[PDB]
Design a protein around this motif. Structure first.
Motif, PDB file in Angstrom:
ATOM      1  N   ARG A   7      -3.241   6.984  -1.116  1.00 24.68           N
ATOM      2  CA  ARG A   7      -2.785   5.723  -1.686  1.00 24.68           C
ATOM      3  C   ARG A   7      -1.262   5.626  -1.642  1.00 24.68           C
ATOM      4  NH1 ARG A   7      -6.882   3.779  -6.329  1.00 24.68           N
ATOM      5  NH2 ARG A   7      -6.523   1.882  -5.087  1.00 24.68           N
ATOM      6  N   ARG A   8      -0.597   6.769  -1.777  1.00 21.04           N
ATOM      7  CA  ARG A   8       0.859   6.812  -1.754  1.00 21.04           C
ATOM      8  C   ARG A   8       1.390   6.552  -0.347  1.00 21.04           C
ATOM      9  NH1 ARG A   8       0.171  11.570  -4.332  1.00 21.04           N
ATOM     10  NH2 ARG A   8      -0.915  12.088  -2.378  1.00 21.04           N
ATOM     11  N   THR A   9       0.869   7.298   0.623  1.00 21.80           N
ATOM     12  CA  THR A   9       1.291   7.150   2.010  1.00 21.80           C
ATOM     13  C   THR A   9       0.519   6.032   2.702  1.00 21.80           C
ATOM     14  OG1 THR A   9      -0.166   8.438   3.476  1.00 21.80           O
ATOM     15  CG2 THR A   9       1.160   9.663   1.874  1.00 21.80           C
ATOM     16  N   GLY A  10      -0.798   6.029   2.523  1.00 26.77           N
ATOM     17  CA  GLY A  10      -1.628   5.009   3.136  1.00 26.77           C
ATOM     18  C   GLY A  10      -2.282   5.488   4.418  1.00 26.77           C
ATOM     19  N   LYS A  11      -2.409   6.802   4.561  1.00 25.53           N
ATOM     20  CA  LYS A  11      -3.020   7.388   5.748  1.00 25.53           C
ATOM     21  C   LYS A  11      -4.313   8.113   5.392  1.00 25.53           C
ATOM     22  CE  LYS A  11       1.031   7.982   8.728  1.00 25.53           C
ATOM     23  NZ  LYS A  11       1.425   8.794   9.914  1.00 25.53           N
ATOM     24  N   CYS A  12      -5.252   8.134   6.332  1.00 24.30           N
ATOM     25  CA  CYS A  12      -6.534   8.796   6.119  1.00 24.30           C
ATOM     26  C   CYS A  12      -6.617  10.092   6.920  1.00 24.30           C
ATOM     27  CB  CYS A  12      -7.684   7.866   6.512  1.00 24.30           C
ATOM     28  SG  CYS A  12      -7.473   6.145   5.950  1.00 24.30           S
TER      29      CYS A  12
END
Length: 15
Positions: A7-12
């Motif tokens: 959620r902080r970075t936005g990467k999976c």
């Protein structure tokens, strides 16, 4: 899928 996403970075990841 069975992975999640940051959620902080936005990467999976691929677990």
């Amino acid at each position: 899928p069975i992975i999640y996403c940051n959620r902080r970075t936005g990467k999976c990841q691929r677990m």
